[PDB]
Structures are given as structure tokens and as C-alpha cells.
Design a binder for this molecule. Structure first.
Ligand SMILES: [Mn+2]
Ligand SMILES: [Mn+2]
Lengths: 249, 273, 582, 293
């Protein structure tokens, strides 16, 4: 249990990411019964295992809404930030800015995912596992509804984080700005059913992200794909040379 | 479109001292006819064209007064199209257990699955029915009476898409064609906004569960805004029945979410609506 | 944190599922090796001593895990602290956990030092054999033989007298365990110890008013008879087994009928000559069929260990009447047992003794009413082929092969088909074309597949034994004429026959006589015949020359490889790629 | 790629034919391949004569080998199993493993249907889950088998006339078009058309009636005649009840119960039978007894 982190860092063959998930689940289950020295000994290991990969996409399959929420809450223990995220352009340590941008990206991703037609798994029985799954789904829906009412400042925080570049790293700042622009474009693309005159900002952010990925996206991978170009083409077609099918419309 | 001599020359189990090897036959076996419909492809649609032309000549009210300036188009009589829809409903499904114009809820479709399946089989055996729907969808208030056929076809398509394991829609060509045709018919019959006209267009490369959810949203919208003989007031300009929508919030939201989940392939279809 | 293991063990073990419990039992070893030796010797063991669970799988898990703590507590110098947990888990309500506990204790008792043994393990069993529940007494009696040679003679006498006192109980719920332990406990006892005190105990246990105790008393008896020498059998153990073999119950009689070969091989031949004859005869003339079947099953190997001075006499004078009276019995179990066991005494009696009385009983058990005895009398007919002349056994089975060749069951038919090739070559050729040809032609069209393949192999053996040109006009045309039926089974049978005869009939006949049939049976719409034809072509490939394989086999294989099925296509492609034809 | 996998399949079959189970990865790959294979099959598998239809095996590998020795080898003749080969048996994993191996190796030469025991709530209370936990140590092979059982077809149509299915008729089903329009990729519920198709039983009742098992209905002769006349069928094959001769005719030769599990639960001591249908739709009932061990 103690040498699990070193074993995962040495080789990702056995228990690559399931060990950290199990540790976080055990720490969350033990946190209800007055966890004195049980949750503190597992939250640090979970944060270390999450920072060893330093990604958000690969840490989304199993931790759908609650596990990743607890992981982010444990990782954000450095900066309290009781009020709204503001004044991020000042001199701040890099780990705090990283935590805030990761939290904003996670919130945007959950807000976008909570409105998908993704097919659900069919059920034809009733037992304790079904009740547990129903309770987990209800808790996830409640958390998503609570986070949706506070997502008004998330876009402003992402814009402020993408505008500033005082992270003492040009490549890291450019990657963070590109990620924030992609998240803002994805969030604005799903806000077309609310009101009009909003696709302009989405198209601008998409063009900025495309230019960034063309010049220099980041050092890592799994950050951009043809989805960005497709969203840019969709925003250009919605805004209105031309194509054969587009000329008629 | 749509005795003992041979049994004696090979008997006695080739031993002439024991019984037969088998123990009898069940029925007949090896059905002789086994015929398939392969009459012709060409010159078959022209018979349908002639029949539709006869029906148009029959329903169109006279007619021949040079309306407009040079593009006078005669309208279709509502009574003739209503009678056509009535006889079509009577020929396809003579049942009347759920022949009400009010669309029942979705779960209600889980009890009359046999009627929906027989309607789907009748539609797949004779494509002319679809063409007949194209005659009923011309008159606005005519399609409101032929609602049982549309409900049964939609329920059959939903039941087929719920039990479809293929990740691509092209694996079932007839079902996709029937879905697009049904949505186009119920949209051009002054019952659905053009968003549904774009939905049946983008059906070409959609996932099966996505198509099922879109058809379920269609069912919900038709349940809310039911096709009824009222709300089709007459216009003093021409004999056309204009439907003024007083549209679907959650339906448009579901459509937008389906379109956004597949931006990597349906990007150009977003700018159309 | 030193309290973290306790905090994670006090809650994870209390749950609703048992998989986590088994995982925790598996990880106790890692927890102990990570906590250190002092931390598991200080408070971990007293903490795990008083854990009384409710289910039983965790009990078996902890019982099998405690036996793997040899080098994780401190070694033989620190085995005195693992005693409280074992003595607490030994006194429970379940049974299998008690067996696991006694196995673990017997396994870990080898690495114990003799001084530590005599100092600590003796008080353990002394306090365990005096408990209130029967579980304690049943678990104490099994920890005496392993610690006997290491302790001194005083402790030996103490444990012996304590065992003698504890086996004087009134209810057999502990006497059963005591009797089961007498089997493995008497291995280390000397002669005087078993002559002085074990004989009275055995005589008191043999005279018990219960029947379940004799089940194990007979095992103790055969054990002490095998262990003791010859000079202490004819006056000590004989009366007990004699009075036990004629008890009012049939269980002890069945047990002594089963465990009789060890007795007759340990007491020697003379003791079996004096008084074992009546003891063996009274077990064959009872009303229960179990004892008779057991005696019949055991007499075969009982005769094997009999000297050649009075074997034939006692067989022709005493064994023969019992055999004759047991063969004509109405019960089917004893008849089947006799039919399955008596075909092993033929080499013992000799050649001139089978035709005397073995042939009548064999023919009687062969043509019987129930198939159970026939399945046994026909499955052991190969061991009488060497001791009896082939002509004699072929002539004796003539009035029976006219009916046993075609009956309801197929095992008898299988045995007849397997034994036929040893008879068709001796009865000449006229007998073959008289009845055996019809018999084989009827076997080739049987319903089941085992009889069909057996007849195929028999026809192969016959065509290898008789000749090639002989079957060219007698068997080949009749087999080839069967390939015209609407049934696919007969066609597959003919294909299998062509495959099995292509390697014996040379290559000249298989070129224009059997080859055109396989070539014309390729347009069969049945998908289960085309792959068989392809496999037949593959098999006859190396047999035929390259000219025939290149002239007509290659085009027909190319034509067969262009169909819609996948199995026949794969078989044809494999046949093409194995014969290097493409 | 294909030849090496075929040879591996033959080796797996030869290993299973000697009372030897496979490993975890081998069973996982076999279940995956069976999932990709059975996805193309519909609910009513169109089987073509000639065939050799069997009944319940209830996890009896020795009885399965006896059946193979009686009714021809598996690659030679066609086979049609109607479920119940996973529960109530000492060797249950070996039987289903051999069956699924023959299915993935001879997809056009053998067909297997789904029974009432091929589920997740029945295998846990009859010993199959216990056998998977004891033999393989963990409980992953059982999970793979229960996930694969959802892909097994429901019924089978032999020559367009014979209708083979485990349970029997259904009150909510009037034609085969309803059976073809069912989502078989679902756990067997306690009520519905699939539950009745997998839990029905024939009797001389007439009409319908609740079954003493707890699930499914009980039809009579008139219902069987109506179902056979409204679908062009001439016979309904089933395997859900324990018989003695092996085959039983009911409802004026309209329903055929074929129990191919000899010595059911090792306590009845009955026989077993299979029905071999030739090319001309001629039936032959081949009977057998439990092979000695
Ligand atoms: Mn069953
Ligand atoms: Mn069943």
C-alpha cells in the first residue's frame, strides 16, 4: 500500500491507474466516519499519482464526476480560494495557477458532458448494486446542477488565465492558453440554444486555437485533433470563397 | 411488388431384411415453390407514376381557370385526400384499439408492438404505401387523420433501433430509408418545423441510439403538439391550410446536443439551421 | 503511522462481501512482514485470538493462512506465541475448519525443536483433550503420533495412558475420531505397547453396541495386522475379526469384505488356509448383495496371493460351488460384478481348466437378460485370448454371435466388432461370405457413430489380413453402391471407408474404381460432404501418383475452392497447401 | 494471422476434450471472438437441414462426449443445442467452453441457443459461480461467460418449418416477427416475452396458466396449434423438462421435448435422446445412456 506509488512510477503494467482510483475511493469512504489519519495518508498518494501523469483526458474514463471531483478538491488544498477566482494575473506560484486552470477545464468538461445523448447501460434487475448506482447518479446530477449555477465566472477565470503569461514558461503558457481557448469554444458551441450573437466569440476562440496548434501547440500529445477544425468549419458556416454545398445555402 | 414407385425403387433400407433407417417425416420438407419476386426494376415506377397522376386528376378540384400569372398550380381537395387517408388506414391496419388522434406516451408503445410490427411489414412489402402518404402529405389537414400508420411506423422504427447492434446506420438500408421518408412526410404535411427536415437529412451518418433518441424527441413533440383537425384555420387568399405554431424547446436542445456530440462529421450540417 | 494497519483492519474485515475478507486474509502476511516481528508478537496475535466471526469461509481462510507463519514470527524459537490462536480456532462448531486446523498443526509440528515441543506442545494437548465439547476431544486425538518419537519415555507413557482414558467415552462422537487416529498413531508404537494396552482397547471398541465404530475398527485392525509381524497374529487379532465379520449388521461385513486382500497378504498363506476359508465363505452367502459383490470383486486378487500347494483344490472344491450359486442369482449387481471380475482368473487356472467350468459360466453370463452384466462380460474378453486357443474361443462364440452382433446396446456391439478380426481370420473364408459379410454391411449402416467407425476399422483390419484382390469384388462394390442415398450419413460413411481403404488397397485400384466416386461426389449441395470429400482427396494425395493429382485432382480442387462456404474452402486450401499442388 | 488462430483453436479443442480447462487469457479471447461472431446472428437463427438437434446438457462433459460419440463428431455433422449447459453439473465450465470453442471454430456447423440458466441470477444459486470461483481462483471467467450469454440467439428455424427454442410459446407473442424484433442483449427479466420464451412449459391445460417454476406461462394444445398454423410451422422443438425416454411428443405431434442430459443431477438415472434430421426432413431419435466413468 505504501510502495504502490513507487511501483506504479517504475512500471505501469500492473495497477497503472486503478490503484489510485481505489485509494481515492477508500479515502472518500473513510472520510465519513471521522477520518483522522486515514484520508490524509491516501489523498497525498492520489494527488502524487495524478500529477505523475499530468493529464486530464486520461484521468476521465473511470473518474467520471465524483472521483475526479474529490481528486481536484484534494489537489486544491494548497490555495484555499474561498471567494471567486480573481486577480490571477498577479505574482502567484505556478502550482496554484495550474490547479485553478485544471479545475476550470474540469468544470467546463463536466458542463459539456452533462448534455450528451450518450447511450446508457440497460438494466433488467434490482439489487443493492442498482440502488448504489442510482444513488451515485443522483449525487452526480446534484453536483452537476450545483456547478452549473456557478459556471458563469468559470469562463472569465479561463480568459484571465489565458491572457496572463507570467508562469515563467512560454511553452507552458501557450499550451494553457490554447487549452483555455478550446474549452471556451466548446462551452460556447453548446450555448446556441440560449441566445444568438454568441457564435462570433466561439469562432474567434476556434481560430485562435487553430493558429496556436499550427504554430506550436504543446510538448505533450492528445490535446488537439480534427474536432477543432470541424468546430471551426461549423462556426464559419453558421456565421456565413464557398463550397458547392455551402454556396446553395 | 410482392408417388410410391420412386419410394419403392429405393426402399427396404438397401437390406431387404430390416426396417427403414429413419422414423418418418414431420411435414413435407423441401418446399417446392421457393419463388422470389424478380419481375422487373424498370417500367414499375412508371405504373406508380400513372396511378399517382390519376389520383391527382381525381382529387384536384376544377381547375383550369389560369390561376396566377403563368404558374397556376391547382390545390388538392381536402375531402378527397381525407378519404384517401381513411381508406389507406382501413386497408393497412383495420384495428381501432388505439386509433385516437391524441398521441399516447412512449411507454404506451410497449403494449401494441404487434400492430406496429405488422404495419412495418405491410410497409416493407408494398412501397406504394409510402407514395400514397406523399399524396396525403400534400393537403395540410389530410395527414392529421392518417396518424395511426405514422405512429405504428415510428414505434416499429424505435423498436428496431433499440435492438440494433451495428455501430453504423448503413447496415440497415431499408430502415434508414423508411425513417427519412417518414420524417419527410410528417414534416411536409405541415406538422414539424424545418429542424426536423434537417434531422432526417443528417440521419444519413448518425449512430443508432442517436437516431432512436431523435425519434423519441419526435414522438414527444407530436404528443405535445398533436396533429388535430383544428388549429388549421382557413385563409382568404387561397385554399391552403396554414398552421401557425404558437418551437420545441427541449426538442431543439436535444437536437443541438446530438449535433454537437458529432461535430467531427456533422460540422457542415450545423450552418444550415 | 503504526495505528493505520489497525484502523484499516478493524473496518475492512467487517463488511457484506467475502472477497474482501479473503483478500485481507491473503494480505495478513504482507501486513505482518511490514509491521515487523516485535509488532506482530506484541499485540497482533492477542488481537487476532479473540476474533469470533459468523460465517465459515473466513475461518477456513485464517486456518490455511496460519499454517504459513514459519519464518515470519521468529522461527522455532518463537512458536510458543502462535498457540493461543490455534487453540481458540480449534474449538468451534464447524467441522472442515477443524480438519484444516489439524492438518496445519501436523504440518508445522516437524520444524519444532524437541525441547520446545516437550515444553509447550504437551500441555496444549493435555488441556485440549479435557474440554467440554466433543470438538476439543476430536482435535486432540490427532496430535499424538507426530510428537511421540521426540519426547522421552515418560511423556510417551503419559500420552498413552491419557489416550486410553479419553477413548473410554460413552458416545461415539469422539470414538470415531479416536479410531481414525489409531490408523496413523500405531506407526511409531513398539511391540510391548501394542500388546499390553492397545489390545484391550481394541477388544472393547470391537464389542461396541454401535455399528458406525466398526467402520473404522476394521481399518485399525488391518493397520495393526499389516504393521505387526507374523508371530503375533494367529492368537491376538483373529478372534476379534472373526467375531466382527459375523455381526448382526451388514456394514462391518461389507467393510471386512472390502479390506480382505491386505489381511490375506499380511497374515500369510498358512493362516488363510487354517480359518480364513469359513470367514470368506460366510461373506458370499448373505441376504445383502453388497457383501457378495465385494467378495466377488476381491476374490480375484485374493487368489493371486495364494500359494500353489492348495490353490486348485480349494478352487475346484470350495470356490466353484460359490461361483455357480452366485452366477444364477437374481440380483443384477452381483452378476455384473462377477462378469467384470471373473475374467482375470483364467491365466491362474490354466489352459485345461477354462473348458472345464469357465466356458459354461461365461456363456451363461454372456446370453443374459439384463444388459448390465453383458456390458461387463463383453468388456473383459481380451485377457482370455492368450490362455485359450483361438479356434476354441471362435467356435464357442458361434451360437452367441448370431444374436449379440445386433441388439439394443452398442457397447456389446463395439466389443464384438473389436474382437471380430481375431476370429474372421481363423474361421476361414466361407464363414465370412456366409454371415460375417452381412454382419459388417449391417454394422456399416448403424445409427450411432462409434459402431460405424469401429466397423470401419474392423474392415480395414480384415482387408489388411486377408488380401487386396479378394475384397476388390466383394466389399468395394457394395461400399461404392451405398453412395447414392439421400442421407448424408451413409455418404460420409462411404467416404470414411474410401479413406481407410485407400492406404491398404494400393494405388492401382484407387485410381479408376474408388477415385471416380470421390470425384463425382464433389457437386453435392450438402455442405457437410464437400469438406469430407476434400479431406479424402488430401488423404489419398500422397497415396496416388503425381500424374493423377495433376490431371483431375487439381482442376476439381480449383473448382471447389470457388464456392460460398468457408469451412469447405478452408479445408480445400489446406489440402492444396499441404500437397504442394498449387 | 488466420491459420495460426485456427491451429490455436484446434489445440484448445483438443485440450478441452481431455477434461482440461483453459487459462484466463485464453477464455477471455474466446469470449471476445464469440461476441464478435454472435453479433451478426439474429434472434431466430435460420438453420438449414440436415442437422442433429440436442437438448439440455446441464454441464456434463462426460455426457457431452458420449453424445458426440453417439451422434457423430462435431466437425462432421451439424448440431443445434437449445441451452441449459451451464448449471447443475460438476464439470460445467468445460462443457460451455467446448461448446463456445466449437461455435467460434464451426460457426456454420453448430448453433447454440440461450436457456433459462444462461443468466447472472441463476448461475449464482446453482453452483456455476462456485465452480468458476474454485477452479480459476478469481471470478472473471464467470463474468466473461455471463457477458457472452447475452449474445446467444433465442430461437432457431430449421427448414422454415421446425421452430426450436428452450422455453416455449409466449402469450405476448403471436408470430416470429415479434421474436425477431426483440433485444436479446439484455438480462433475462422476471416477466415479458423473452422470459416466457425461456421459461414456458407445455401441458394439457388449454389456453394459458401460471407455471409452478415461478416464471413463464403454461400453454395447451389449442395454443400450440394456433401458433403452428399462424406461422407456417409444423413442429416446435423444446428442451426444458425432464423426461425418461429422451423425447416426448405433445399436442398431437406438435411439440417435441428433447432432453439430452442422461442421469439428470446424478439421481434420476434416466436415458437421453437427440433428434437427427436428414436432408429430406426425416427425423430419427437416437437414444443413449450415461457413459461409465
Ligand atoms: Mn433445465
Ligand atoms: Mn431450461
Amino acid at each position: 500500500d505504501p510502495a504502490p506509488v513507487q511501483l506504479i512510477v517504475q512500471f505501469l503494467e500492473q495497477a497503472s491507474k486503478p490503484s489510485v482510483n481505489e485509494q481515492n475511493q477508500v479515502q472518500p469512504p473513510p472520510d465519513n466516519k471521522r477520518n483522522r489519519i486515514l484520508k490524509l495518508l491516501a489523498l497525498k498518494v492520489a494527488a502524487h499519482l495524478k500529477w505523475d501523469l499530468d493529464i486530464l483526458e486520461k484521468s476521465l474514463s473511470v473518474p467520471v464526476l465524483n472521483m475526479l471531483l474529490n481528486e481536484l478538491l484534494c489537489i486544491s488544498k494548497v490555495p484555499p480560494g474561498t471567494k471567486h477566482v480573481d486577480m490571477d494575473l498577479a505574482t502567484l506560484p505556478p502550482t496554484t495557477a495550474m490547479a485553478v486552470l485544471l479545475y476550470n477545464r474540469w468544470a467546463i468538461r463536466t458542463i459539456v458532458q452533462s448534455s450528451f445523448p450518450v447511450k446508457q447501460a440497460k438494466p433488467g434487475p434490482p439489487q443493492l448494486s442498482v440502488m448504489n448506482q442510482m444513488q451515485q447518479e443522483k449525487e452526480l446530477t446534484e453536483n452537476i446542477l450545483k456547478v452549473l449555477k456557478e459556471q458563469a465566472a468559470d469562463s472569465i477565470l479561463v480568459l484571465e488565465a489565458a491572457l496572463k503569461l507570467n508562469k515563467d514558461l512560454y511553452v507552458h503558457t501557450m499550451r494553457t492558453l490554447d487549452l483555455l481557448a478550446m474549452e471556451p469554444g466548446m462551452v460556447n458551441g453548446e450555448t446556441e440554444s440560449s441566445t444568438a450573437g454568441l457564435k462570433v466569440k466561439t469562432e474567434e476562440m476556434q481560430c485562435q486555437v487553430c493558429y496556436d496548434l499550427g504554430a506550436a501547440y504543446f510538448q505533450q500529445g492528445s490535446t488537439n485533433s480534427a474536432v477543432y477544425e470541424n468546430a471551426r468549419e461549423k462556426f464559419f458556416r453558421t456565421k456565413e470563397t464557398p463550397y458547392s454545398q455551402v454556396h446553395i445555402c | 411488388g410482392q408417388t410410391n414407385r420412386r419410394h419403392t425403387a429405393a426402399v427396404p433400407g438397401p437390406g431387404g431384411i430390416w426396417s427403414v433407417f429413419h422414423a418418418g417425416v414431420i411435414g413435407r420438407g423441401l418446399k417446392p415453390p421457393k419463388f422470389v419476386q424478380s419481375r422487373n426494376q424498370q417500367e414499375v415506377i412508371y405504373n406508380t407514376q400513372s396511378l399517382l397522376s390519376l389520383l391527382v386528376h381525381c382529387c384536384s378540384a376544377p381547375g383550369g381557370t389560369e390561376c396566377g400569372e403563368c404558374w397556376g398550380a391547382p390545390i388538392l381537395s381536402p375531402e378527397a385526400a381525407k378519404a384517401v387517408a381513411v381508406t389507406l388506414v382501413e386497408s393497412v391496419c383495420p384495428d381501432a384499439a388505439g386509433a385516437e388522434l391524441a398521441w399516447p406516451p412512449e411507454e404506451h408503445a410497449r403494449a401494441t408492438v404487434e400492430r406496429d410490427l405488422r404495419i412495418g411489414r405491410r410497409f416493407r412489402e408494398q412501397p406504394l404505401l409510402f407514395e400514397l402518404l406523399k399524396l396525403v402529405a400534400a393537403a395540410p389537414p389530410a395527414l392529421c387523420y392518417c396518424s395511426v400508420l405514422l405512429r405504428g411506423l415510428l414505434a416499429a422504427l424505435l423498436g428496431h433501433w433499440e435492438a440494433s447492434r451495428h455501430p453504423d446506420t448503413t447496415h440497415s438500408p431499408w430502415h434508414l430509408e423508411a425513417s427519412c421518408t417518414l420524417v419527410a412526410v410528417m414534416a411536409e404535411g405541415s406538422l414539424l418545423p424545418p429542424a426536423l427536415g434537417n434531422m432526417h437529412e443528417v440521419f444519413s451518418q448518425l449512430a443508432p441510439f442517436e437516431v432512436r433518441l431523435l425519434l423519441l424527441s419526435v414522438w414527444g413533440f407530436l404528443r405535445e403538439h398533436g396533429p388535430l383537425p383544428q388549429k388549421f384555420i382557413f385563409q382568404s387568399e387561397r385554399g391552403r391550410f396554414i398552421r401557425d405554431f404558437s418551437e420545441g424547446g427541449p426538442h431543439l436542445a436535444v437536437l443541438h446536443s446530438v449535433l454537437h456530440r458529432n461535430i467531427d462529421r456533422l460540422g457542415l450540417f450545423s450552418g444550415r439551421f | 503511522d503504526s495505528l493505520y494497519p489497525i484502523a484499516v483492519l478493524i473496518d475492512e474485515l467487517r463488511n457484506e462481501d467475502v472477497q474482501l475478507r479473503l483478500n485481507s486474509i491473503k494480505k495478513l502476511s504482507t501486513i505482518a512482514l511490514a509491521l515487523g516481528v516485535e509488532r506482530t508478537r506484541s499485540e497482533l496475535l492477542p488481537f487476532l485470538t479473540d476474533t469470533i466471526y459468523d460465517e465459515d469461509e473466513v475461518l477456513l481462510a485464517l486456518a490455511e493462512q496460519l499454517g504459513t507463519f514459519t519464518t515470519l514470527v521468529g522461527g522455532p524459537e518463537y512458536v510458543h506465541c502462535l498457540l493461543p490462536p490455534l487453540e481458540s480456532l480449534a474449538t468451534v462448531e464447524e467441522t472442515v475448519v477443524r480438519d484444516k486446523a489439524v492438518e496445519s498443526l501436523r504440518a508445522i509440528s516437524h520444524e519444532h525443536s524437541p525441547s520446545d515441543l516437550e515444553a509447550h506442545f504437551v500441555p496444549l494437548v493435555k488441556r485440549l483433550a479435557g474440554g467440554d465439547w466433543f470438538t476439543s476431544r476430536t482435535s486432540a486425538c490427532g496430535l499424538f503420533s507426530v510428537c511421540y518419537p521426540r519426547v522421552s519415555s515418560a511423556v510417551k507413557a503419559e500420552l498413552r495412558q491419557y489416550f486410553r482414558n479419553l477413548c473410554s467415552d460413552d458416545t461415539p462422537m469422539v470414538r470415531r475420531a479416536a479410531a481414525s487416529k489409531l490408523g496413523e498413531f500405531a506407526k511409531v508404537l513398539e511391540l510391548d505397547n501394542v500388546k499390553s494396552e492397545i489390545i484391550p482397547m481394541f477388544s472393547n471398541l470391537a464389542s461396541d453396541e454401535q455399528d458406525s465404530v466398526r467402520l473404522l475398527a476394521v481399518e485399525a485392525c488391518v493397520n495393526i495386522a499389516q504393521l505387526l509381524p507374523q508371530e503375533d497374529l494367529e492368537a491376538l487379532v483373529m478372534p476379534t475379526l472373526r467375531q466382527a465379520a459375523e455381526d448382526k449388521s451388514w456394514r462391518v461385513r461389507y467393510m471386512v469384505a472390502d479390506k480382505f486382500t491386505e489381511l490375506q497378504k499380511a497374515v500369510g498363506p498358512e493362516i488363510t488356509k487354517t480359518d480364513l476359508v469359513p470367514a470368506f465363505q460366510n461373506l458370499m452367502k448373505d441376504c445383502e448383495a453388497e457383501v457378495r459383490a465385494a467378495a466377488s470383486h476381491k476374490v480375484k486378487e485374493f487368489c493371486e496371493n495364494l500359494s500353489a500347494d492348495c490353490r486348485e483344490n480349494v478352487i475346484m472344491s470350495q470356490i466353484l460351488p460359490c461361483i455357480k450359486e452366485l452366477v444364477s442369482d437374481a440380483n443384477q449387481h452381483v452378476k455384473s460384478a462377477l462378469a467384470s471380475v471373473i475374467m482375470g482368473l483364467s491365466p491362474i487356472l490354466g489352459k485345461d481348466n477354462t473348458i472345464e467350468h469357465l466356458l459354461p459360466l461365461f456363456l451363461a453370463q454372456l446370453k443374459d437378460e439384463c444388459p448390465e452384466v453383458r456390458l461387463n462380460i463383453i468388456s473383459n474378453l481380451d485377457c482370455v485370448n492368450e490362455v485359450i486357443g483361438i479356434r476354441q474361443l471362435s467356435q464357442s462364440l458361434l451360437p452367441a454371435i448370431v444374436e449379440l452382433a445386433e441388439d439394443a446396446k452398442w457397447r456389446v456391439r463395439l466389443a464384438i466388432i473389436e474382437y471380430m478380426p481375431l476370429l474372421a481370420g481363423q474361421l476361414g473364408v466361407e464363414f465370412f461370405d456366409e454371415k460375417l459379410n452381412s454382419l459388417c454391411m449391417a454394422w456399416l449402416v448403424d445409427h450411432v457413430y462409434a459402431i460405424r467407425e469401429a466397423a470401419t476399422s474392423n474392415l480395414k483390419k480384415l482387408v489388411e489380413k486377408f488380401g487386396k484382390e479378394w475384397a476388390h469384388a466383394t466389399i468395394i462394390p457394395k461400399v461404392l453402391a451405398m453412395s447414392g442415398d439421400p442421407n448424408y450419413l451413409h455418404r460420409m460413411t462411404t467416404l470414411f471407408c474410401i479413406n481407410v481403404l485407400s492406404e491398404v488397397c494400393g494405388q492401382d485400384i484407387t485410381t479408376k474404381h474408388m477415385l471416380p466416386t470421390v470425384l463425382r461426389m464433389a457437386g453435392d449441395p450438402v455442405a457437410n460432404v464437400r469438406f469430407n470429400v476434400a479431406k479424402s482427396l488430401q488423404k489419398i494425395g500422397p497415396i496416388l501418383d503425381n500424374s493423377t493429382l495433376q490431371s483431375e485432382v487439381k482442376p476439381i480442387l480449383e473448382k471447389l475452392t470457388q464456392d460460398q462456404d468457408v469451412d469447405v474452402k478452408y479445408f480445400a486450401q489446406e489440402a492444396l497447401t499441404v500437397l504442394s499442388l498449387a | 494471422d488466420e491459420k495460426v488462430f485456427t491451429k490455436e483453436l484446434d489445440q484448445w479443442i483438443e485440450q478441452l476434450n481431455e477434461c482440461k480447462q483453459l487459462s484466463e487469457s485464453q477464455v477471455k479471447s474466446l469470449c471476445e471472438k464469440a461476441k464478435e461472431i454472435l453479433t451478426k446472428e439474429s434472434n431466430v437463427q435460420e438453420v438449414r437441414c440436415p442437422v442433429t438437434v440436442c437438448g439440455d446438457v446441464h454441464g456434463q462433459f462426460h455426457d457431452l462426449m458420449e453424445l458426440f460419440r453417439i451422434g457423430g463428431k462435431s466437425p462432421d455433422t451439424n448440431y443445434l443445442f437449445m441451452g441449459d449447459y451451464v448449471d447443475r453439473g460438476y464439470y460445467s465450465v468445460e462443457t460451455v467452453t467446448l461448446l463456445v470453442a466449437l461455435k467460434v471454430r464451426y460457426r456454420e456447423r453448430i448453433t447454440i441457443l440461450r436457456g433459462n440458466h444462461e443468466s447472472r441470477q441463476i448461475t449464482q444459486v446453482y453452483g456455476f459461480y462456485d465452480e468458476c470461483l474454485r477452479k480459476y481462483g478469481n471470478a472473471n471467467v464467470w463474468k466473461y461467460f455471463t457477458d457472452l450469454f447475452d449474445y446467444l440467439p433465442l430461437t432457431a428455424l430449421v427448414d422454415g418449418q421446425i421452430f426450436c427454442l428452450h422455453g416455449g410459446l409466449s402469450p405476448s407473442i403471436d408470430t416470429l416477427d415479434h421474436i425477431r424484433a426483440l433485444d436479446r442483449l439484455q438480462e433475462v427479466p422476471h416477466e415479458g416475452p423473452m422470459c416466457d420464451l425461456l421459461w414456458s412449459d407445455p401441458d394439457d391445460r388449454g389456453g394459458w396458466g401460471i407455471s409452478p417454476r415461478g416464471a413463464g406461462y403454461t400453454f395447451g394444445q389449442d395454443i400450440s396449434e394456433t401458433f403452428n398454423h399462424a406461422n407456417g410451422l409444423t413442429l416446435v422443438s423444446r428442451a426444458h423438462q425432464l423426461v425418461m425416454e429422451g423425447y416426448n411428443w405433445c399436442h398431437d405431434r406438435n411439440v417435441v421435448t428433447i432432453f439430452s442430459a442422461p442421469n439428470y443431477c446424478y439421481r434420476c438415472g434416466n436415458q437421453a435422446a437427440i433428434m437427427e434430421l436428414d436432408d429430406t426432413l426425416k427425423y430419427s431419435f437416437l437414444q443413449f445412456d450415461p457413459a461409465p466413468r
